[PDB]
Design a protein around this motif. Sequence first.
Motif, PDB file in Angstrom:
ATOM      1  N   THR A   1      -6.490   8.394  -2.423  1.00 21.46           N
ATOM      2  CA  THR A   1      -6.471   7.806  -1.094  1.00 21.46           C
ATOM      3  C   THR A   1      -5.430   8.428  -0.174  1.00 21.46           C
ATOM      4  N   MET A   2      -4.687   9.428  -0.639  1.00 20.35           N
ATOM      5  CA  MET A   2      -3.559   9.963   0.111  1.00 20.35           C
ATOM      6  C   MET A   2      -4.004  10.987   1.145  1.00 20.35           C
TER       7      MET A   2
ATOM      8  N   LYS B   1      -8.179   1.807   1.349  1.00 19.51           N
ATOM      9  CA  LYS B   1      -7.442   3.062   1.276  1.00 19.51           C
ATOM     10  C   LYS B   1      -5.948   2.800   1.127  1.00 19.51           C
TER      11      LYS B   1
ATOM     12  N   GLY C   1      -2.591   1.987  -1.019  1.00 18.53           N
ATOM     13  CA  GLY C   1      -2.126   2.295  -2.363  1.00 18.53           C
ATOM     14  C   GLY C   1      -1.709   1.071  -3.155  1.00 18.53           C
TER      15      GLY C   1
ATOM     16  N   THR D   1       1.338   4.795  -1.531  1.00 16.58           N
ATOM     17  CA  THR D   1       0.700   5.873  -2.282  1.00 16.58           C
ATOM     18  C   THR D   1       1.693   6.989  -2.589  1.00 16.58           C
TER      19      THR D   1
HETATM   20  K   LIG Z   1      -3.536   5.777   0.804  1.00 19.99           K
END
Ligand SMILES: [K+]
Lengths: 527, 527, 527
Positions: free
Chosen positions: A30-31, A51, A53, A90
């Motif tokens: 998701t980064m 999205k 973390g 994240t």
């Molecule tokens: K993320």
Amino acid sequence: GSAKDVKFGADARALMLQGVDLLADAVAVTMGPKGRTVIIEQSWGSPKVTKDGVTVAKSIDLKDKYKNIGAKLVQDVANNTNEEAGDGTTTATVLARSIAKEGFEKISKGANPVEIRRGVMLAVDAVIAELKKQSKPVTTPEEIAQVATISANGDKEIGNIISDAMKKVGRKGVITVKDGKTLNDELEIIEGMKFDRGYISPYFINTSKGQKCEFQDAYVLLSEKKISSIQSIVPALEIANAHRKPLVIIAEDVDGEALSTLVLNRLKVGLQVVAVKAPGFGDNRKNQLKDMAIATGGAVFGEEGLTLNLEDVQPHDLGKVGEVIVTKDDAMLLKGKGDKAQIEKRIQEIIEQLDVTTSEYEKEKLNERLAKLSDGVAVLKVGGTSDVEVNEKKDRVTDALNATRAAVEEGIVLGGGCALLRCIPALDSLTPANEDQKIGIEIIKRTLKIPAMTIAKNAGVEGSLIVEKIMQSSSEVGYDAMAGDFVNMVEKGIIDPTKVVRTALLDAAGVASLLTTAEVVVTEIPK
Amino acid sequence: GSAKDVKFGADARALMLQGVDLLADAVAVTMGPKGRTVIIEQSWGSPKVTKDGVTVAKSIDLKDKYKNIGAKLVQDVANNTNEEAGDGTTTATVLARSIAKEGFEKISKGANPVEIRRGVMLAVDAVIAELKKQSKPVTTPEEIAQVATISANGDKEIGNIISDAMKKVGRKGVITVKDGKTLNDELEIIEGMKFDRGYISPYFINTSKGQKCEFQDAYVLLSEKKISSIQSIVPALEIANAHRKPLVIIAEDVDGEALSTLVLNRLKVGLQVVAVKAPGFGDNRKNQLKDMAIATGGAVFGEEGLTLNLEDVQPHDLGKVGEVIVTKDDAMLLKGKGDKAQIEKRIQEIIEQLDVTTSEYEKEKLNERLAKLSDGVAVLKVGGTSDVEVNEKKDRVTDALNATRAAVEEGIVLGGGCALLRCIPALDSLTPANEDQKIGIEIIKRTLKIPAMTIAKNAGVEGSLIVEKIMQSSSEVGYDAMAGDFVNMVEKGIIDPTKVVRTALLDAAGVASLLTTAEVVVTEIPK
Amino acid sequence: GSAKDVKFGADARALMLQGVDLLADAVAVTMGPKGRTVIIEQSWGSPKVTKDGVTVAKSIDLKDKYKNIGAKLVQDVANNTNEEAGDGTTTATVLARSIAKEGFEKISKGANPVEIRRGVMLAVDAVIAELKKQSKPVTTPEEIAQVATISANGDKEIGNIISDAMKKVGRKGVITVKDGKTLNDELEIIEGMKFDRGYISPYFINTSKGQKCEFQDAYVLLSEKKISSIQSIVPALEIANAHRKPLVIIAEDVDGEALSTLVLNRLKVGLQVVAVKAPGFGDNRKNQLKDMAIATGGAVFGEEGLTLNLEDVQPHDLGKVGEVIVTKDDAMLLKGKGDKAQIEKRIQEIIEQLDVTTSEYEKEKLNERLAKLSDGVAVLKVGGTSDVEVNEKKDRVTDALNATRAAVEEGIVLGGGCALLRCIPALDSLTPANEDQKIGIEIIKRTLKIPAMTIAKNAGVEGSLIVEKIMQSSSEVGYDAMAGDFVNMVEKGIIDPTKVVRTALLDAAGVASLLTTAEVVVTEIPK
Ligand SMILES: [K+]
Ligand SMILES: Nc1ncnc2c1ncn2[C@@H]1O[C@H](COP(=O)(O)OP(=O)(O)OP(=O)(O)O)[C@@H](O)[C@H]1O
Ligand SMILES: Nc1ncnc2c1ncn2[C@@H]1O[C@H](COP(=O)(O)OP(=O)(O)OP(=O)(O)O)[C@@H](O)[C@H]1O
Ligand SMILES: Nc1ncnc2c1ncn2[C@@H]1O[C@H](COP(=O)(O)OP(=O)(O)OP(=O)(O)O)[C@@H](O)[C@H]1O
Ligand SMILES: [K+]
Ligand SMILES: [K+]
Ligand SMILES: [Mg+2]
Ligand SMILES: [Mg+2]
Ligand SMILES: [Mg+2]
């Protein structure tokens, strides 16, 4: 009392690393701008697409308890980063996984992992000092829009709407996110003193177009106690009729006798009156009544320490507004005629009340009181066609608000992981005390390339070459993974809050370096 | 009445030794400066990382009941060492495992394990006499810092902050560890009579800068009974108004009539008054009120025996303070003008009350009252980024405080296990009564090398060569396992409390030598 | 807290697509004139036969959690399309499956599915703009009949009866579907003010032929309170007996004394009176009484703000009706003699009350009041031999009413999926920002032929050839799948509401394009 299983050394560390690796591999996708989403099954209906973390981290538990220990520790990393900063979870997850893996690789018979932890924390202190050295304050609303745009996955409309809300209600003002019934996002500014208490009697409507009560230049009567006797309402009505001016009675409640008097004088002779219940439950209701009295230039009747009674009411005792809107659901007061010096004194008293508070529920109430005594509150209504869309976009709007507030309070650094990348020579200028501290410093030095590598890896390019070319470049040049270019990051708007970066690094290091000190792991035998 | 399994002799002893060996192998990895940590899964959330021996011991239970018997016995060893001294539980665990193994090896047909136990206890008595012979009293705060530094895993900041707290509040003062919201540790010194009751009414605030009540040279009115009527409070207000001095009223409570009078006089005419609830929830409340009256020079009103009434108050009856701070959550009294001889008499009465109690809860209250009367208290706030690091560091801070108190009360010996190593000629000077007592003396003699061997083994070197080199050296020379060299232990600060060492040895020997007397083991059938 | 399973990438996407594919394959068989039905087992008795897409979608859950996530997402699509529009749920289901499949096929290493989603939403915005450009308003009741006939699976009797209902009570009037005890459908028009409260005493019947109470040119007495005493009922009887006119007393209730007086006056001397309970429970009862007072030209007695008592009743105070019918279960008022401008003021007040409502329970109450004031209500009773038949046909009648209301409010476009087919050149006139937005535009472009292909495939012909021949034809020519030939769709009555088409497209796109952004799927371990 329960039977326990006990593991020693490298096998236990390998299982814990498998758990850490599973959670970090689910979070790391998701980064960055080219990051993807995670679908989490909810047990009560529609799944959740995210999205975020910390949302992916918190929603992962493993049946293997040795792997679940590492999963819980990286969950603690992501949750602490979410609590402290509201963004960067994240980054914290991938930094924690990198520190845990590099610390697990470096454990031998002669190694001292506690001194390795000491070196890790010394290196993190050096990097945080360098981050504070290379940070610059936010001074333009364009920087605010850039921070809110980067933190909302490149959505420039969210960044623009947060910049407009922060222009209107101030940089330290109150902005609240909620869902919307329309496809598009919208921003509503509530000025003055609006509270969610409607009528007491529906007969008070004098504007049938919107089914609302509308007065201009109206007297205001504020009561700390519930107005019950007829004798407690006759003199106020006498003043309001002898001066030919409307009357808004804001009280704890109005009983049947006083309601019957008010409705009879409205429906029979035509008296411009409206009764509104006092918002709040308890001490906050009394504080809001005092705020309304200071803003409107009146006194609150029914005082528990002053003992001001409703039978001796003077025209100067009544407050004054220049507009009041009373709807079935809520009521607002506009252009109160209170003294400005007393309003400023109440504002300073609220500000000094904000200095000593730790409950984080009274702070929100006090900030709402301060906003209602000032330019007002902002509401961001998030649009979408379905609830899953609105939740996914609302997580990003919350991330952008948190990152924008952190940038306001502590400044900005370069985005894309380049801020941590420019702190490597500050570790190269460090003298370790022994070999284990040197090992920890090298662990942090290798970890400082992880966020940029992950962002570039999510973009489908080789992250190591990208990081090498960033480090070979000037200090202003980083990698735009969205365009796939090597750009000036400040001029292109890719910027991060300093607070988020240092919070993620510190919260990852403090837990991962303590995880890498372990030799024995004790779990329960599964039933 | 449940069905039982019964085992005889060597098989049962082997299974119990397997349990003892598993628990001691999990505990021994945490011993010394180069010791590691143990991660224990908690059922409700985040796991616990610890270097504390009794925490690892108490958190291990085995599904095999024969091994669980030995595990429970060595848990009793570690728990008794924790209760008596608060430190040295890992040393006690490894000593107990050594005694159990050496006693299990020495059991044969002609052996008498009860006489072996007698010889073990005689040898332990000899070693404890030698330890008390070679002990030195603590006479410098540098020794305090060295003891607290060695006990907190070589942390110099924890040792320095404990040394500063003990400098300020005294060597027998009250020092309380708690968590901190800041990354670094802090020490807060609370002087005077501070208690956990704030104001009663928010209108008493005369200093809104910190939302507190601030008076200088104030009268104190102390009541053992609730103040409810007007006549109970009017004469005291009359005295305070006539002498033109502030008045703090510490009572069980203040009912609405007296509170209304106090708030009306505070707001309307500007009377300098404040009302505070009496701290405590019973007899301790009345004892704290009497201590406040003695410190301030006043008398407690509404006493159950004397029957003093609030309706006849004299100016000499009220106490006096130089400064009082009343916040929302706490109130403190500074510079009481009480008679010093009566304060000393109350201090001596509290001290004599401590010698006739054993509840270990009234002792804490008596010590807190003594600290509030003489020197104040110290609060150590332990810092960290997460709760797991805070708990891990708080364990070591508690260990360092316990070891420092033990060193204050009983003195110091050499650290690193060298104090037990220097007690071996005292065993060589013994004459056994028979062969089994000789066996027990030899068991204790071989056991005395175990702590230094374990400390050197955790450092990655061969512990037997280290122990032989220590015993071949002078009496002041030991092994610094942190630096890995042979040094003067007193000059390098590597010292231990005598109480901790003798507590560990006695608690290990008493249970392990009784364990080695067993021939039959009875367990339940596992359902 | 529960143990989780985590899947990555193509395997998770394949399982989610399997779930989406099963749910869409079960829904798609019901599409178009040649669509079939689905039998769903109900746990409490007879199964349900349906041709409704949202009913099939909501009634499908899978044991595989990864497939169930996709099933729940397409179920969310169908449920949203049912709630916003009331029709088009099968179209939305097949569009969502097409977007999900084409987006899953296009995910690679260098692909950015979030920008693909951006391109999808941009293309859907273009298509919705084109749909609004090519829409035309409904201006004839023949178009109303054609829309209701197409939406009811070609049943021209349902379309004719809905056209008659909308002719009689208006296109914005109240029409309610219910079951029928007769094989054939029927339409009942209720004019005037008929409510669900009959008489109170059975002696009031003056027409035994239908067991009803029948008066002409009757006085009406309305009470907001419970008429109980003799004095509260005597003067109304006095004026109704002095004027020789019937009296209908509509009150909250009538107690034993007043009821005994009324029954004794009717039975003994021959007084034309009837007592009727006031319909409603709460504020809606009072609002309906005020509506009846404005319609009949009388005033409500017992008002909670006006305080009008029943002991001073004037002849002008009583309302007047031309005819009243009172039965056991219902009572209606006909040709009330109220002033017309006050009726219009009350109607405008109800309309302005409808402007601000969000509960969607008070909205139907206000609509029913407005219908009872303006033009009555329409009831469609659906015929059939069995309950399963009546439910299956009631689903189509509800679909036809929803589609007719959507066509009234927003206009019509071409039916048969041809409306979406004519919006493909508006995507051909679009310049993508990058490759991923181009991918999303191509996904929507390929998806726009799916409804026509599904309708043709259900008819047993090759859908792709039909769609190609439609797109090669003029803009007015589509494919009648019922007759199986290419015709003018407007002249043949094959038309759709614009709102239904755009709602289905937007609801399918918004969820499917977010489903195609996923990389990790987290489910629970099946216990
Ligand atoms: K993320
Ligand atoms: N166009 C871009 N080019 C390069 N880096 C970018 C770009 N846009 C954002 N970034 C970087 O990507 C990171 C943001 O990633 P993301 O928001 O997904 O995760 P996070 O902030 O670590 O945590 P959370 O998941 O809680 O939001 C930041 O380091 C930011 O500087
Ligand atoms: N630098 C050092 N060199 C040599 N020995 C040391 C050094 N630092 C500490 N020691 C010794 O290590 C021991 C302390 O170990 P540790 O505190 O882990 O265990 P413990 O006191 O037996 O139990 P607990 O787990 O309850 O603290 C003491 O004997 C101390 O003298
Ligand atoms: N005779 C016909 N020839 C061609 N297309 C037709 C004909 N009759 C209806 N259609 C089309 O078929 C579709 C109607 O399908 P159907 O009503 O079964 O499903 P829906 O509207 O998508 O959803 P729901 O199942 O909720 O009613 C519309 O697009 C309509 O224009
Ligand atoms: K230890
Ligand atoms: K259908
Ligand atoms: Mg972010
Ligand atoms: Mg210790
Ligand atoms: Mg349909």
